[PDB]
Amino acid sequence: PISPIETVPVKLKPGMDGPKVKQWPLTEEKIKALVEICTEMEKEGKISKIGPENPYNTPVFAIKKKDSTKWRKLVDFRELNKRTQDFWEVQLGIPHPAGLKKKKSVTVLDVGDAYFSVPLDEDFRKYTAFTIPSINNETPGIRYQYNVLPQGWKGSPAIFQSSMTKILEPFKKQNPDIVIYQYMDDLYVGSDLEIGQHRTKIEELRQHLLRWGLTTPDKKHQKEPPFLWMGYELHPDKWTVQPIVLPEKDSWTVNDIQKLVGKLNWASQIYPGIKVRQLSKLLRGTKALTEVIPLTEEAELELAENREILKEPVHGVYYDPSKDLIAEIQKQGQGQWTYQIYQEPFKNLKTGKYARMRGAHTNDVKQLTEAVQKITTESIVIWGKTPKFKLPIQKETWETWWTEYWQATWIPEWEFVNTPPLVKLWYQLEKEPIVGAETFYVDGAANRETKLGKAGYVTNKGRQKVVPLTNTTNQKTELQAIYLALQDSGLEVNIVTDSQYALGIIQAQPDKSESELVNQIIEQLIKKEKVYLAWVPAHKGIGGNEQVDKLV
Amino acid sequence: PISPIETVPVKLKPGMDGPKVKQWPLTEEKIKALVEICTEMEKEGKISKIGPENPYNTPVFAIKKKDSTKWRKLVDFRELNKRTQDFWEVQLGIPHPAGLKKKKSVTVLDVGDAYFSVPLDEDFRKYTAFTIPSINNETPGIRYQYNVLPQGWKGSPAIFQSSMTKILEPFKKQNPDIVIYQYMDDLYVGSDLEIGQHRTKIEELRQHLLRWGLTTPDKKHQKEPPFLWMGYELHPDKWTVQPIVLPEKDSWTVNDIQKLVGKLNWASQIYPGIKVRQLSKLLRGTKALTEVIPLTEEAELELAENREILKEPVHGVYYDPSKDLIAEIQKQGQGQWTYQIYQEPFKNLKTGKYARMRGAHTNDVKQLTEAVQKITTESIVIWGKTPKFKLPIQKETWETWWTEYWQATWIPEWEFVNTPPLVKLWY
Ligand SMILES: Cc1cc(C)c(Nc2ccnc(Nc3ccc(C#N)cc3)n2)c(C)c1
């Protein structure tokens, strides 16, 4: 029940001292249960009767179940943990099954009991002190102290997981085949022996552990494969997500919308193609909760498709370090991009999605990259290497861009996969003014107060125009003036703006943006043959822009 | 090894607790590397394995040192530093010789090996702790902490001074004109004698060190030269300004004069004495763009007036050692990048340009990394302290590869800026 394990020295935060909380009620019956518990506990050495020598008490209690036959002591160390040093965290991040190597047979051993087997640093027992009242009042009650690891102390998961890891070591060496992984109260073992031998070894594992006071059972309660873990369904040869449920409701509220979206991303790791742009576009309102939201048209259509998807079970395969890691990405449409990672052409290893939520003006090629990148980061964590990519873009395209783009990128190994859709530049602005082309001296201001303004142009050829605009911003007109020149210009045009805003946007070479304004513009740019944009200092400067702002 | 000393007390800045930084995921190879390295360090007795009672943590990486065959461990002590050495740039500050930059040539030699002998104050160790990750985080990371002055941590050098200036004094004697500056793990030695003599005074020094114990694991080459005649040798007296100039042209078009009026108007934030009006007034019309046009009254007087004030360095620009250094870097294209190191907008302290060879062998990233590490050293050599880079790269990307071509012993401070429009043009 307790081991000759060396203890981890602990301490209490810098200036702090032991918890001196108390509580002294007395349900005669409970006090018996606890005193009944305490004995079997001190008798087993897990605690020990201590007497007034400054002990710092803590709350005691008793709880009971429905399929009960017993009771349960449940101390509350809340005010103890708030005084203990910090420990090496345990769950940096959870391993992802998409990167788990296949095995023959597995096995999990219940090791919850365990932490009452691992020793507590002598000098820190004096704090685990609690007192259970007797009946009425000549004795404060019976007084104990913890000798192993309290059930709710801060540094217990820690000090356990550590201790365990050291104990496994001999076993782990004398058996490199066997993979051991411990989670919370579980200790999963996985190897390549046929069940028979597997269990030989397992029992050895058990015996080993047993010599160290950490006991375990051979036929307690729960079930085996599938193994329900972290919301995963694990099998000795495949793995899949927790069966999910897309609730059907007559009225949906933020809370339900969230919990709805949440499940969908989670199903995304293996289910191919799940979209989510529409359903979240809604939640874009950040502070309601019981504020019912009208599932719009789009969201609706979307949800359904994920149903069509989900209706079908999909499972994933494991990682063979013997083969390559291939990554293929396809654009779904409105900033939506999907991908599946495999070594084998049929069953996948993992899948996911990437939607440029960031900002509101990005190009199709840039996005392909943000994606390739999102995945590279992913693989490194899961498999420790970069996959080989298969993507819908042709070198000419790509190389062109990374050469034109002001930021540095680094696209690794990649093969072209000719399959619609296709990433490509729909247009390119000219780098030199076009000789002959009419020159439009564009401009357009707006009233920050009245939201009224105008957008015009005045050409070299003497041609003018001024359109009045209601309910807009300067950026909006500074963009409508350009869209104006484009509509009235010919196939080859020269445009001058005193707006770095409109300038840069157009320049980014946006495949799209829902800003219907920029769209009409982007589309004109597509309908043109040759376009040249030109910037110029707004006020101190040219007279053409001013000539349109005196107008404005 | 034998206990060559009796440690020195290191206390973090008050109100400061050790570092708890996250370990970046690593490549399967890089792990094996560290794993190997660390097992030796452990036998040698440099580092020790730690328990759960050590909550702290600092980042680590595996890089290729000067391209050799074996990997080198590079710990990212950037946080422990802020927290310690800032108040150790005080108690034990190492002074920066304002003339090293004037020297004819500067060679740099890795003396990091030195520290691996001076035992570290035991009550400080916990802080140096680092953790080697496991792929797919399946296995609990391995955890170690330093028992000796670790490289990378700016307090290691600051404690070694005593021990260093001793090893050197009987060489700085018979070589009173070469200046030796020690910045962390490197030694910058500068002289004004034909490279042939320098390169010797160097090997002259390199051995002094080696005979007094310090190994200078820098056996660069011999006399069997596959084109790699490289040894770190900088030339600071040639570190001159690159006044970007306006273009001189016979035929000036509307378009052209336009951009020109632009660059100038942007220029005026660094030089307020610039004017355009008369040149610009030659644009007030709404003429075509391809059209060539004529000078004006003092337009030519201005293209020359400014062209002057713009070829002279701006005053009021001084080096505040109370502030930090900010280096901005912009991609110019075709292996060419430009940079600005300052402390306040437009008051540039120094500006250069970098450039790598033609296509088929280099990508941007590798370049940036290089441009960076380059700029940094310049800075160390001129001001004795590394700057903070405003990098024009996607964060994540950078994070993924910056180590792939990172050859330096130290790591600067950086961040990422998606923005520069005119700047590219102006420079
Ligand atoms: C929970 C769980 C159990 C184990 C043994 C591991 N570790 C490893 C290490 C290497 N390969 C595998 N494959 C594997 C794990 C569980 C199952 C099942 N069922 C099948 C294969 N698991 C992890 C990360 C989680």
Query: What's the CATH number where A131 sits?
Result: 3.10.10.10
Determine contact, residues B127/B56, Cβ cutoff 8 Å: yes
Distance from CA of A500 to the nearest CA of B (A): 9
Q: Give the span between the Cα atoms of A183 and A230, in whole angstroms.
A: 10
**B156 burial via Cβ count (<10 Å: 0-12, 13-18, 19+):** buried
Name the residue at shortest CA distance from atom 22 of ligand 1. A100
Distances (CA, A) of B336 to B330, B356, B399, B403: 9, 7, 22, 21
| Total residues belonging to chain A | 552
Based on the domain organization, do A121 and A32 belong to the same domain? Answer: yes
Please say whether the beta carbons of B21 and B59 come within 8 A.
Answer: yes
Rounded distance between C-alpha atoms, residue B103 and residue B189, angstroms: 9
Burial class (CB in 10 A: 0-12, 13-18, 19+), B50: buried
Q: Note whether B392 contacts A: Cβ–Cβ < 8 A.
A: yes
CA separation for the pair A192, A181 (Å, rounded): 15
Contact by Cβ (8 Å): A455, A480 = yes
DSSP structure class, residue A84: B
Contact of B280 with chain A, judged by CB distance below 8 Å, is answered with: yes
Please give the single-letter amino acid code of residue B424: K
Beta carbons of A406 and B276 less than 8 Å apart: no
CA–CA separation, A441 vs A497, rounded Å? Answer: 7
Residue A211 tokens, joined: 């010599």
Residues 6+ apart with CB under 8 A from A240: A232, A233, A270, A313, A314, A315, A316
The whole-angstrom separation of Cα A389 and Cα A416 is: 8
Query: Among candidates A181, A279, A282, which has minimal Cα distance to A227?
Result: A181
- Report the alpha-carbon distance of residue A453 to residue A476 in Å, rounded: 10
**Domain of A19, in residue numbers:** 1-90+116-156
In three-state secondary structure terms, A235 is coil
Total domain count for chain A? 5
Q: Are A541 and A444 in a shared domain? A: yes
What is the Cα–Cα distance from A363 to A356, expressed in whole angstroms? Answer: 10
Residue type, A338: T
Q: Which chain B residues contact residue A403 at CB under 8 A?
A: 333
Q: Residue A505 is part of a domain; what is its CATH number?
A: 3.30.420.10
Question: B90: which residues sit within 8 A by CB, 6+ positions away?
Answer: none
Asked if residue A137 and residue A13 are part of one domain, the reply reads yes
Domain-ending residue, one of A426, A444, A467? A426
- Name residues whose C-beta falls within 8 Å of residue B39's C-beta, 6 or more positions apart in sequence: none
How far, in Å, CA of B136 to CA of A93, rounded?
Answer: 9
Q: Give the residue from B136, B395, B402 with the most A CB atoms within 10 Å of its CB, the best one to mutate.
A: B136
**E strand or H helix that includes residue B242:** none
* Segment (H or E) for A31: helix A28-43
What is the resolution in angstroms?
A: 3.0
Q: To 10 degrees, what angle do helices A195-211 and A156-173 make?
A: 120
User: Based on the domain organization, do A549 and A473 belong to the same domain?
Assistant: yes
Task: Output the six-digit token pair for B427.
Answer: 């420079």
- Say how many CA atoms lie within 13 Å of A507 toward its Cβ: 19
Q: Are residues A17 and A66 in the same domain?
A: yes
Q: Which residue of B has its CA nearest to A159?
A: B52
Torsion sign, CA atoms B50, B51, B53, B57 = positive
Other C-beta atoms closer than 10 Å to the C-beta of A398 total 21
Say whether both A110 and A182 belong to one domain.
yes
Could you tell me the end-to-end alpha-carbon distance of chain B, in angstroms, rounded to an integer? 55
3-class secondary structure, B272: coil
Q: Which atom of ligand 1 is nearest to the CA of A189?
A: 5
Beta bridge partners of A355: A336
Claim to verify: residue A372 and residue A439 sit in the same structural domain: no
Which residues does ligand 1 sit against, CB inside 6 Å?
A 95, 100-101, 103, 106, 179, 181, 188, 190, 225, 227, 229, 234-236; B 138
User: Which candidate from B55, B276, B397 shows the least CB-CB separation from A87?
Assistant: B55
What is the per-residue burial (b if ≥16 Cβ within 10 Å, else e) of B388-414?
A: ebbbbbbeebbebbbbebbebbbbbeb
DSSP A489: S
Q: Do B140 and A544 touch (CB under 8 A)?
A: no
Q: How far is the CA of A99 from the centre of ligand 1 (A)?
A: 10
Of the candidates A189, A210, A213, the one whose C-alpha atom is nearest the C-alpha of residue A201 is: A189
Question: Do both A2 and A144 map to the same domain?
Answer: yes
C-alpha B267: how far from its chain's center?
Answer: 27
Q: How many CA atoms lie within 13 A of B264 on its CB side?
A: 26
User: Which residues are CB-neighbours of A408 under 8 A, at least 6 positions away?
Assistant: B331, B364, B365, B367, B368, B392, B393, B397
| Residue A295 sits in the same domain as residue A333 | no
For residue B61, what are the CA distances in angstroms to A544, B34, B411?
A: 58, 8, 11
CATH number of the domain enclosing A96: 3.30.70.270
Q: Which residues contact B194 (CB under 8 A, 6 or more apart)?
A: none
The 3-state DSSP class for residue B213 equals coil
Identify any residues that bridge with A227 across adjacent strands, giving them in sequence order.
A234
Whose CA is closest to atom 4 on ligand 1? Answer: A181
Burial tier of B238 (Cβ tally within 10 Å: 0-12, 13-18, 19+): exposed
Q: Are residues A101 and A180 in the same domain?
A: yes
Residues A139 and A234 in one domain: no
Size of interface A-B (CB pairs under 8 A): 164
Q: Where among A426, A448, A464 does a domain terminate?
A: A426
**Domains of chain B in sequence order:** 9-98+124-164 (3.10.10.10), 99-123+165-233 (3.30.70.270), 234-319 (3.30.70.270), 320-426 (3.30.70.270)
d(C-alpha B107, C-alpha B202), whole Å: 8
Strands A326-331 and A239-241: unpaired
Q: Rounded to whole angstroms, what are the CA distances from A421 to A363, A366, A389?
A: 15, 16, 16
* Residue in B143, B364, B400 closest to A377 by CB: B400
Q: Are residues A383 and A442 in the same domain?
A: no
For chain B, what percentages of helix, strand and coil (3-state, to nearest 5) are there? 30, 20, 50
Tell me how far apart the terminal alpha carbons of chain A are, to the nearest angstrom: 87
Q: How far is the alpha carbon of B366 from chain A, nearest alpha carbon, in Å?
A: 9
Gap between the Cα atoms of B394 and A528, Å rounded: 32
> How far apart (Å, rounded) are the C-alpha atoms in residues B381 and B107?
11
- Residues near A528 by Cβ (< 8 Å), separated by ≥ 6? A427, A486, A489, A491, A492, A493
Query: Read out DSSP for B305-362?
Result: HHHHHTTS--SS----TTS--EEEEEE-SSSEEEEEEESSTT-EEEEEEEE---STT-
By residue count, chain B amounts to: 427
Q: Which of B362, B397, B401 to mutate to test the interface with A (most CBs of A within 10 A)?
A: B397
Domain end call among A285, A304, A319: A319
Burial A109-138 (b: 16+ CB within 10 A, else e): bebeebbbbbbbeeebbebbbbbbbeeeee
Cβ contact A498:A536 at 8 Å: yes
